[PDB]
Design a protein around this ligand. Structure first.
Ligand SMILES: Cc1cn([C@H]2C[C@H](O)[C@@H](COP(=O)(O)OP(=O)(O)OP(=O)(O)O)O2)c(=O)[nH]c1=O
Ligand SMILES: Cc1cn([C@H]2C[C@H](O)[C@@H](COP(=O)(O)OP(=O)(O)OP(=O)(O)O)O2)c(=O)[nH]c1=O
Ligand SMILES: Cc1cn([C@H]2C[C@H](O)[C@@H](COP(=O)(O)OP(=O)(O)OP(=O)(O)O)O2)c(=O)[nH]c1=O
Ligand SMILES: Cc1cn([C@H]2C[C@H](O)[C@@H](COP(=O)(O)OP(=O)(O)OP(=O)(O)O)O2)c(=O)[nH]c1=O
Ligand SMILES: Cc1cn([C@H]2C[C@H](O)[C@@H](COP(=O)(O)OP(=O)(O)OP(=O)(O)O)O2)c(=O)[nH]c1=O
Ligand SMILES: Cc1cn([C@H]2C[C@H](O)[C@@H](COP(=O)(O)OP(=O)(O)OP(=O)(O)O)O2)c(=O)[nH]c1=O
Ligand SMILES: [Mg+2]
Ligand SMILES: [Mg+2]
Ligand SMILES: [Mg+2]
Ligand SMILES: [Mg+2]
Ligand SMILES: [Mg+2]
Ligand SMILES: [Mg+2]
Ligand SMILES: [Mg+2]
Lengths: 189, 189, 188, 188, 189, 188
């Protein structure tokens, strides 16, 4: 069951779904448009020879921030991490889905990739995997709309929400473009 | 809540969900298979130096149509825009999700790219961002199944559906592979 | 309507949703984490000049298996097919959605791509389209968590589920990383 | 034996080595700098599925010309054909070698491919295979210096020079960015 | 000083410059056209995580041979190793330079890897680094002309020619597409 | 006319061809092997939208130096600038040609872009355009042999050698991996 605009506003003003800062004009028929932050992470290490999801690789990424008023330039075939301006707090009976915007998709900007679910009980900023598949570089302007977020009802409240210790959650209360933490609790055969 | 085949047909023959032209044999257990049109847009401009979502960039794409009976050839690492053969009209209490087909995915043909939602009240053809990630070119045949569409029930009807002036919608009643219109109402810092 | 952890377990232990082998610690607040198998398919043919979805192209892929304890190395811009360790059986009133994991996405590993739908009544392993978009190769370890699966309620049971002959389904009971079968019943 | 600036000028003003239009300020210590024309060929066909050197493939390329004053934009990983402003006529006792310029190499501009020889007796413009390996598009301005050309003495005059019918030459007197003609006299 | 056709034939028929098999119709005004063999090496290992020129990496390449009458298909952005049909034996007073052919360069086929020089005294087949920069795959036909070879006079014969033990040569008498042997005698800081 | 080993050593020990530091065991039958320095330039700017050879673009590159004993990792499809350990001084009657090494070419390591000419009179280090075309990253070790240099005799001494003001030379006495200076004296 998917929340409409009427029921989204109702969740926000009742304080059960948190969006901060919230702006009413961003509410769309079925979802809410979200905006790009001003910090990015680039993959510009020259020491590592490979990425091993089983190891923590500290210096794999660098923090970059466009000079104010200037854009960040995403080169063709480059991959960077970005963040949402807004902070999201979901209750334990709602699930989120993050999708890109059609306007940007049509330019060749892939805006997350492969990763849907925002878990019930999640609280923090959202990390965005930004990718360019066009043959020109794209200029990203901090504060621009970058994606959109819709809410699904769950059948019943989550027994062990995100951030609870039974779930073993890696990203509760995350801030910037946060690097991968897969080495934590890594399993294999 | 996701509509099954039974309830999809029921929506179509009651005239609340529009598909044109409709073909019953395309209805799947949980979704409906959709077909590729015969118009494409290619990014073959040589004047622009970069893509700026904040500006309208008119001559960024060219319209192309395969000679009849011939295929469109998608080169490895190319990106093109395509369209659906069908025209979709959604009511204000249903939302749509577009996904690729597993048979094509396994060949290295991406269909949706970063984007998912179809808004309640939307009406028109659907633009497809087609990409090739294999190491060989892929021949696309106009009229082929290219993807699939499922419908989600909303919690309550959309207050300000797609195309309504409160939503500020850019694509209502779109026809061919439509270029990006992100410059319209563009916000930033 | 999306099943929570409580209702997922309830489906599994009532035998209506099959996961094999099942492991309870893989159940997440809204979904269940799934693990990578040890067979892959690589696109290393040098005879074909193009891919035609309308023709069956037999030798388009090769089967590869890492030497035991070793990883499979996914090169930047490479595309391979993988499989899930688990075998999934869905009832005819549930649908599934497969998504990647945020920890791996942040590394540049795209796990499926462009396909989300598991059909009511589907039974088999899941084939995964694995892709690397970083500028370094990634080591994939067999048995690692690779993705996650949630379940949606349908409005009513599927009239003609997956694998039923009215649906014309190509992949019922699939085993390894299965090649594309689009040539079957191809329309244009 | 490689001609120096002194001996190059001597060949040009004696009329044995033709450069047209010639400009004396383009002569360098060991070579002569050459300039980019204003016509290009782009590979933007969507009908062909592969390149077969053994077949003539007519519509493989399109002719493009920047609007006057504007640059041609070479995208990262694109490949285009260009031409020299100048027309070169070599005698039958000199051979030419074409190389890029270090100022452009350092920007990521590959300017000819993997080819260097200008055969004795060749006459015509030179086709340039232009390539970008940087991560940003490069703007090429018509009339810019794009490469350089030096001359080697042969041990003795060429018995059957370029363009002679015993050599079987495909490109004698070529004009614009000329598409490949490998299908002519193709052996296998 | 560069040998012309006249002086090339004279070297060949005097037995000082060896080409086997020799074909007179391949002699060009300033060079001699050379043909592609029928064995290739592809880089299709999945165990190594990086290339270290300092280590021998045995299974880095696989030997492949087109089925007879069929072509080898070089994919866009692929890199393979090939060989010359001919076996070259240079004297100790001549140097060779290998270059591609203009007809193939214009199709997007790079025939070697930045490499040029063939050393006085060298004897064997030549390994070719084959590369595709077009957006379509190229079909290479065994026995096709693939490049060309000219000869430069040296100021005086080579004191310690190629293959002599003072030179420390890695490839004397090579046969097929031979993998890199840089690990032999590798120096660093 | 191309100098052999015998005549190269003769030029070096007579002081007319400068190599510093020189090492005799690097002299090869027809050329002299050269070694990689320990500074690189990477193209990691995020402000510029395109490369314009006609404008100086200051912050286009960054200086990077591997931690001592560690390698520099060149990623597939990356492009960096490097330098030669040695400093070359050529006389005004010799020309140089730079080429890669076959052992590295076979690994997928491109070592100069399209260029090759070293001008008579040139003095300084040589800037190397390093490129990776394999599907795995390559580790470059500072001090490794990276390329080779041969010498051609000119017909007669250069009238206006490199670095002379008539030639208008941009790179005389260059030190590290020097960025492009094409904007200087740019014509169009
Ligand atoms: C999303 C996904 C599904 N599947 C499985 C579950 C689906 O029910 C099944 C079919 O997916 P479909 O998208 O329906 O594939 P298809 O429509 O091209 O072929 P068919 O005629 O069988 O419908 O494949 C995968 O194997 N891998 C995946 O990544
Ligand atoms: C997912 C998808 C949607 N659509 C259609 C259906 C959506 O209702 C419509 C708009 O999608 P949006 O994602 O909302 O595009 P937008 O937010 O950038 O622009 P707008 O101001 O109009 O909201 O586009 C496509 O054409 N192609 C696609 O791939
Ligand atoms: C989809 C998405 C989610 N998130 C957030 C919301 C999710 O609830 C949270 C974790 O997503 P998960 O997919 O659950 O990541 P994970 O399973 O690898 O790690 P964990 O142990 O924490 O479960 O990350 C992002 O930051 N970026 C994204 O693109
Ligand atoms: C081939 C090569 C030369 N060089 C040196 C030797 C040359 O004498 C010098 C200039 O090469 P040029 O090719 O002449 O560069 P340029 O013509 O663009 O600039 P200029 O005005 O200086 O002529 O650069 C390198 O630094 N790196 C290289 O890869
Ligand atoms: C190197 C080069 C040469 N040329 C010219 C000068 C050469 O003499 C001519 C042919 O080069 P070749 O290398 O001989 O081309 P080819 O052998 O494939 O064809 P042909 O039968 O004519 O020999 O092309 C270019 O146009 N562009 C270039 O980049
Ligand atoms: C240019 C070229 C040369 N060769 C042959 C002829 C050369 O004399 C020989 C070695 O070339 P080199 O460039 O000298 O290779 P190297 O210095 O890395 O190794 P070595 O210790 O043997 O000198 O390889 C090829 O096989 N393929 C080619 O593309
Ligand atoms: Mg929208
Ligand atoms: Mg289906
Ligand atoms: Mg999880
Ligand atoms: Mg110069
Ligand atoms: Mg020729
Ligand atoms: Mg050597
Ligand atoms: Mg060269």
């Amino acid at each position: 069951m998917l929340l409409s605009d009427r029921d989204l506003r109702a969740e926000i003003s009742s304080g059960r779904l948190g969006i901060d800062p919230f702006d009413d004009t961003l509410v769309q028929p079925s979802s809410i448009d979200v905006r790009l932050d001003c910090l990015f992470r680039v993959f510009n290490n020259t020491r590592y020879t490979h990425i091993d999801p089983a190891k923590q690789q500290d210096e794999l990424t660098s923090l970059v921030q466009p000079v104010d008023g200037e854009p960040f330039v995403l080169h063709p075939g480059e991959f960077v991490l970005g963040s949402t301006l807004e902070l999201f707090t979901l209750p334990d009976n709602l699930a989120g889905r993050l999708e890109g915007k059609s306007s940007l998709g049509r330019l060749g900007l892939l805006t997350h990739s492969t990763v849907g679910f925002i878990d019930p009980g999640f609280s923090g900023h959202i990390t965005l995997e930004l990718s360019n598949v066009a043959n020109l570089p794209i200029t990203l302007w901090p504060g621009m709309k970058i994606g959109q977020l819709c809410m699904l009802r769950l059948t019943s409240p989550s027994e062990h929400p995100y951030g609870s210790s039974r779930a073993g959650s890696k990203y509760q209360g995350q801030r910037g473009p946060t690097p991968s933490r897969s080495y934590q609790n890594f399993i294999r055969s």
